[PDB]
Each structure stands twice: as structure tokens, then as C-alpha cells.
Structure 1
Amino acid sequence: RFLKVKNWETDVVLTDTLHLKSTLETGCTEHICMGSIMLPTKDQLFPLAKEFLDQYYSSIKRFGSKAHMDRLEEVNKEIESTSTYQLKDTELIYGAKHAWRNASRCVGRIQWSKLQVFDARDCTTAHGMFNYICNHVKYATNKGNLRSAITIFPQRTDGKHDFRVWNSQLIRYAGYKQPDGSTLGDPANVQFTEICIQQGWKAPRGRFDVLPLLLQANGNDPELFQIPPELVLEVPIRHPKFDWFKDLGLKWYGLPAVSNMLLEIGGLEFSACPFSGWYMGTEIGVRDYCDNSRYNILEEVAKKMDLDMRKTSSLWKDQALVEINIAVLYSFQSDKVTIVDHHSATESFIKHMENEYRCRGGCPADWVWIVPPMSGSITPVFHQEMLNYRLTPSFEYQPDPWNTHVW
């Protein structure tokens, strides 16, 4: 059934058919919508494999070719024998790019095809993983001129020899629960910060301490590693009009690299597949800095701005929030570290969405996640109806490693 999506700001109506190819379930039903809920075998493997291969070959205009047919048979036999199979470089690359292309929560998918894929499937040790990771970080940071990339470690076999990167992101700050009962650093990592200490890491107990990597190879226990400080590009945060801003003592890293998700291609699962792009300003300025559960810096900034924090109606939080995000973007731009603001990113997503509709016949999108956490209605995506649904290859959530590892 054809589904239509209207943008109420421009009246443009796009038609969606791509959803017909949906596989998984949204979590919603005809009776209840869960759009705002954060997270709602051989016989199993060959169908998924076939689906993927058909996708791959149709994309290269060789749907049905002997090549297509040959490969299909090849995988089938392989699965019957090895109870699994291995992707060819080309299919790996394609799968990775398409997992991104299909990430309904990502606002920067316009860059989907421009992804550097690093095949780390020959890795065997945590030291090896560290090596692959370091090179990834260096290639991606590229001295401020960031470049999207993903490193793919060995795919899952029996689940007991799973490769995993225990960090949620390759680069994140430590979080410690102090005497006061308060939290020093990033509250979002307090637990992990502990496990690292509980492993041997010597925590510096600072506001912005870069955590160590906890790499797991072949189901073995995780080992710690320190990313070469020279490889971790960081930006000090200063305001374009408030010279006192520098006194807040804030900084953030330039490389956002997700490392706790699972990449699924043709039924195959890769539990260790760190991938990175570049920051949208609000991510740091609004969420990391102002989220109550995070660095929660609104109070301070408000104080230093000397404004009435007596009544919410003064919108002093909104006032502060803005300047702070002015300072994030400013700092990044000044040090020449790639960064995008919510206005450009959202506008770019609209264009991308428009291309995806005429080239794909659709674009899965999660409105709740796409709309920036600030100035929602003044960005285009706020007025854009979206259709959310799951498509593979895909990136998926997965249980925290420490919550399931057999030490």
C-alpha cells in the first residue's frame, strides 16, 4: 500500500513504498503507538542471506545474473556446511553503508555513501583490536578534517567467542561518584568508569578524563588500553563575546565514534563495529552539557550571565542554552574541527530525504530523534511528516557486555 508524507511548511507531499520492504517490527500496533519508547540458525540464515544478496545484486544491476545465482548457491552450500558464511569485501562495504543509510535515527545520512570501511575481520587479539582502533581514530580525526568510517571485527559465531568494545564510544570522559554523593565528570559513564578501575585503570579523578578502551576478542576477557593522547583531538570551549566563558573550564572531543552497537548484514552479526562521523553542535551543547543527568551546566552559565533565575518565565535556561551552543560551534570552527549545526544538518536531511524518496521510494525516519533537542520548530524537519520502519542491513542495540560476559 502506498503511503504519503506531507511537509506542512512547504506542502510538498512525497509517496512512500519503500516501507513495503520492512522486516522487523516497530513495537507499535493498531491500538498503541510507542514512537517515543527508547527501545521497544541455518534455516534462519539462508533466507536473510538471500534477501541481502538479492539487494546487493539488484543495486549493481546484475539481479539474477549467473554471478548472482552462483554467489547465492555458494553461500547456501557454505551455510549448510559451515552453518554460516563470509561476506565478500564488496558486500561488506555495501552492507555497512546501507546499515547507515537505514538508520532511521540518524540526521546526517546524506553522507551515507561516503563511508570508509576498514575490514578488521582478520583480527584475533585485543592488542590487534587496539591497533585497528588507533588507525581508525587517526584516519577519521584527520587533524580536524573529520572523515566518516567504520571498523568491522570478526562476525559472531557461537556467541561465546564474541568480539566487543566495552566502551559505548571510543572517546568519552570518566565519571566518578564523589563523597558529597554528587558526581565528578560525566554521570553517563560512572558505571563504566568503575569497571575500568575494577580492572586496573588508574583514574585521575578529573572533570574531563579520557577513558581507556576495554577490548574483548574471541569471547576472552577485556583488556585496557590508552589511546595515544596525540590521537585524541579535543576542543577547549570559549565564547565569541564572553571572555569569562573560558573560565567554565569546558572542553569536548571532536570525534563521535559509536562502539557499542551491533551491525547486521545478510543475517550475519558483527558485535564489534565502531563507526564514526562528526558532531552536530546540539549533541554537546544541549545534551552532554545541559542535560540534567549529564554535566548539567545551565545553573553556572546562568549565574555568570547575571540574569534573573528566580522565575522560569524569564526563560533564563533558554537564554543560557543558546549562548552555550554558540560557544561549542564557535570553538570547533575556530580550531578548524569539523562540526555541523542543527540548522544545516536538518536542512541537509530534508534534501537527502527528498532524494531518497525519488531514488529509493522512501526513507525510514524517527521524528523523535531527528528533531534537534533545541529550536525544534525553526528547523525544517519539525514540519516534515516521517515514516519509521526497520530495514536491513542495520545497526542495532545490544546488551551491555559486562551484563552478560562469563569471566
Structure 2
Amino acid sequence: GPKFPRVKNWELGSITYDTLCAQSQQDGPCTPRRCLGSLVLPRKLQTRPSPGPPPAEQLLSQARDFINQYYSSIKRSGSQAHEERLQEVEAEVASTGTYHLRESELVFGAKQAWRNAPRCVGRIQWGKLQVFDARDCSSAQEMFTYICNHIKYATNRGNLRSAITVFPQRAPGRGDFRIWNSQLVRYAGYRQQDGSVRGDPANVEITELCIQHGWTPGNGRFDVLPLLLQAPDEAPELFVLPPELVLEVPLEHPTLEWFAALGLRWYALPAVSNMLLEIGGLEFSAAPFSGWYMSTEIGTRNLCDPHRYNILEDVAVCMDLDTRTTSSLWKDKAAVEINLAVLHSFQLAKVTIVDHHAATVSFMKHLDNEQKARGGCPADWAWIVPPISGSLTPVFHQEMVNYILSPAFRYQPDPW
């Protein structure tokens, strides 16, 4: 039939064709010889640092393309405003080598970048995003206020609201605005004498960076790390977040009275801060965004992963399961109760969270919406399916096509 990828849902037997991928202008890791689609960081979703400004011709084509998407989103394609804005963009690039976005253009691109994110299962909310323009920001101290305002608005005392704060874009012949941290709120990871790690092993390097930068450490599993904010050409400055600004949730179990005694907990606000936001060829090296958590990110990955908190065995012992044999499914049983504890704790603390069932069910609805809207939806299957109960969720049985659309959230090298 049609010349586009055929996609099937094995649960419903329904078929769809992805015409949207034809719009992709950025290559992926795969080739007809082999699939590199399971790699987290292939050198195809990562934007290396441009020490030199992008070739004026390449920037122009990305700019022209973005503007067209903008005017198209407002239904004025081919209009005088459209042709004038295009003229104004190449004019800017002509004399300055770069250009700047209008306010409403930034809002559009940021929402599109999220909408374009293949690894996000929460894209059904893509239209509801608070874009805080912080392109005026000129100091590391100002970055702190902006971030503090972001956390305040986004947190909204448990009734979380999606938001992003965009700092000045990459300017040739000038340093980047970078947030050294991976997320705004992160737990410290202390490298012990015996080699082990107290806290979160994932955050070991940054913790050692904060220390080297004057931070006076603690010695707990759940210590919130300070921010390491960097303004153009200046070394990073350290800023400590006010405790009242960081909402956390103490984990307890609905029935297992002893779970509370484990002293486990997690922060309520997930805010990625190390990713690059690329819009029309313009790069925004510092542009933290946040929304809310899906229960499995905390209860399964953060808490149960071998290279993270690794609490599966401890909880199994407390549940008195045969941890000596795999066929007892002690890992499956503890993980279930751990995920249930996260849900219960967040629901009790009136903080926003969504479980993996509801989450994926809403993504399917997002998929139908997008099929009608753009004729497809770029999705990364491995990241869309939850880390537990995979086939129990509707997305498992949904084939998916993955490709890179712009605007987009890309990975970038560490500033150090």
C-alpha cells in the first residue's frame, strides 16, 4: 500500500501509517545493516559543543524551517508577515551571524520540542507548558532567582505545573549559560572508604564537583545537592536551595507498617537541567524544564536499580521472601510493594504523580490525537514502556517509529 512505515497495534489489530517521519531532517543512529536503537547516547541525539558559530547557510535553513512551522501553527503560511519575518531573520544572520526569536515564537518552539521528544510518555500534556523567558538573565546570581521562581511556580505546593525557563542562547565568541547539575533537585552520592556509595551513586561526580567548589557536604542517603550555576566565561558559582523550596515526600506503605521505618523518601519535582533546547538552529544550553513524576521512575528505577539505591533485597528481607532463589519472584514482589509505596505516599501528601497504567493509557490517546494532527508521533519504545509490568500496559503492544524532529531537546557534553 502506502510508501510510509506501516505501524500495527497487536492488541487491537489496528493499522496506521507514519507520514510525519518524512519531515525529519536529522539522521539517527540506525542503518539498514543494523539497529542501534537501544543505545541511550548514540552519537545521533547528542549535540556536541560548537566552539565556532554554525555555518551561516546551515543556520539559515534551520531558521527558515522553524519560522515556517511557526506561521503554519498560526495558519499564515505564505503571508506578508511570514515572508517579512523570513526576510528579517536572514537579515539578522546576514550582519550578526545569528538571530533572535520573538516571544511567542519561543513559547511555540519550547512546546514543539517537548511534543517532539521521543522518550517522553507524558506528551499528552504538551500543550500545557509555562514558558518563563529568562533570555535577559546576565549573572549566575540571577540564574538562581529565576530557578527559585521556577521551582516555586512549578511546585505550587504539590499541585505541580509543567514549566521551563529559557536562559540566553549560545552566542559565538562568548561562553555558555550552563547548569552543571543534571536536575534542579538531586540527592548527593558520597564515595565511601570501602568503595561503596552513601546516597545516590548516579550523582557521585557532581557531588564531588560541588565539594571541590566549596560545598560543605553531609552524610546522609537523602541530602539535596546545591546548584552549580555558570554564567558566560565565568567559573561556576555555588547556590544552595532554601529547604522550604524543595518539597519532599516521606515514603510509607498502605499496609506494611514497617515501610515507614525504612526512612526512604523522594523529592516531588522532576526538573531536567542539563539538556540543550534547539529551536530553529539556535541553541539554548541552559533551559531547565519540569513536570511531574510517573511512579515507576522513583519506585522502580531510582529505588530498585542495581546502580542506584538498590533497595530490593532489603525490602525483600523485610517481607521475608526467599531471596536465595530466583524462582520465588522476590524481586518482582518487593518491586510491586515499593511502587505502591511511592503512589500511596504522593497521593497522601497531596503531591502530583501518575502511575504507569494511567500514564501509558493517556499516551495511547496522545498517539491517536497526533495521528490525526501530524500523521504520526516519533516514539522510543524502550523508553515508553514502563520498567515493570511492561505487557500489562497498552503501549507494549503498540509498534512505534522513532525519528528526530526539530525543535528538540538534545543531550550535550558536560561543562567540565
Range class of TM-score, shorter chain: over 0.9
CA–CA distance in 2 between the matches of 1:233 and 1:159? 39
Aligned to 1:30: 32
CA–CA distance in 2 between the matches of 1:107 and 1:353? 10
Residue 240 of structure 1 deviates from its aligned partner by: 0.2
Matched ranges for 1:141-156 at <5 A = 141-156=155-170
**SS of alignment partner, residue 401 of structure 1:** coil
**1:288 pairs with 298, 302, 318, which one?**
302
Residue 180 of structure 1 deviates from its aligned partner by: 2.1
CA–CA distance in 2 between the matches of 1:270 and 1:7? 37
**2:366 pairs with 321, 339, 352, which one?**
352
CA–CA distance in 1 between the matches of 2:233 and 2:111? 27
The 1:96–1:88 alpha-carbon spacing in structure 2 relative to 1, beyond 3 Å, is: same
AA of the residue aligned to 2:94: E
Aligned to 2:394: 380
CA–CA distance in 2 between the matches of 1:160 and 1:299? 50
Matched ranges for 1:9-88 at <5 A = 9-40=11-42, 41-88=55-102
Residue 154 of structure 1 deviates from its aligned partner by: 0.2
The alignment's TM-score, normalised by the length of structure 1, stands at 0.98
CA–CA distance in 1 between the matches of 2:83 and 2:315? 63
Residue 206 of structure 1 deviates from its aligned partner by: 1.0
| 2:354 corresponds to 1:340 | yes
Q: Percent identity?
A: 68
| 2:229 corresponds to 1:229 | no
CA–CA distance in 1 between the matches of 2:173 and 2:302? 33
Residue 185 of structure 1 deviates from its aligned partner by: 0.3
CA–CA distance in 1 between the matches of 2:101 and 2:219? 44
**2:5 pairs with 3, 9, 24, which one?**
3
**SS of alignment partner, residue 244 of structure 1:** helix
CA–CA distance in 1 between the matches of 2:134 and 2:173? 18
**1:241 pairs with 248, 255, 265, which one?**
255
AA of the residue aligned to 2:117: A
CA–CA distance in 2 between the matches of 1:219 and 1:291? 38
Residue 160 of structure 1 deviates from its aligned partner by: 4.0
**SS of alignment partner, residue 16 of structure 2:** strand
Aligned to 1:269: 283
AA of the residue aligned to 1:27: P
Aligned to 1:95: 109
Residue 286 of structure 1 deviates from its aligned partner by: 0.3
AA of the residue aligned to 2:141: H
**SS of alignment partner, residue 214 of structure 1:** strand
The alignment's TM-score, normalised by the length of structure 2, stands at 0.96
AA of the residue aligned to 2:17: T
Q: Larger deviation: 213-222 or 391-400? A: 213-222
Q: Which runs of 4 or more aligned residues in structure 1 lie more than 6 Å from their structure 2 counterparts after TM superposition? A: none
1:48-91 CA-to-partner distances (Å, cap 9, x unmatched) read 00000111111110001000000000011000111101000011
1:93-141 CA-to-partner distances (Å, cap 9, x unmatched) read 0000000000000000000010000000000000000000000000000
CA–CA distance in 1 between the matches of 2:195 and 2:69? 53
CA–CA distance in 2 between the matches of 1:28 and 1:219? 37
Aligned to 1:405: none
**SS of alignment partner, residue 35 of structure 1:** coil
RMSD: 0.7
Residue 159 of structure 1 deviates from its aligned partner by: 6.3
AA of the residue aligned to 2:4: F
Residue 227 of structure 1 deviates from its aligned partner by: 1.1
Matched ranges for 1:89-168 at <5 A = 89-158=103-172, 160-168=174-182
**1:214 pairs with 206, 223, 228, which one?**
228
Figure out how many residues of one structure are paired with residues of the other and give that number.
Answer: 402
CA–CA distance in 2 between the matches of 1:297 and 1:50? 51
Aligned to 1:366: 380
CA–CA distance in 2 between the matches of 1:31 and 1:254? 43
Residue 44 of structure 1 deviates from its aligned partner by: 1.3
**SS of alignment partner, residue 180 of structure 1:** coil
CA–CA distance in 2 between the matches of 1:19 and 1:191? 37
**SS of alignment partner, residue 73 of structure 1:** helix
Aligned to 1:396: 410
Q: Larger deviation: 56-65 or 158-167? A: 158-167
Matched ranges for 1:181-196 at <5 A = 181-196=195-210
**SS of alignment partner, residue 256 of structure 2:** coil
Aligned to 2:48: none
**1:174 pairs with 168, 188, 193, which one?**
188
Q: Larger deviation: 147-156 or 219-228? A: 219-228
**SS of alignment partner, residue 298 of structure 2:** helix
Q: Larger deviation: 218-227 or 332-341? A: 218-227
Residue 361 of structure 1 deviates from its aligned partner by: 0.6
1:263-284 CA-to-partner distances (Å, cap 9, x unmatched) read 0001000000000000000000
Gaps of 5+ in 2: 43-54
**SS of alignment partner, residue 17 of structure 2:** strand
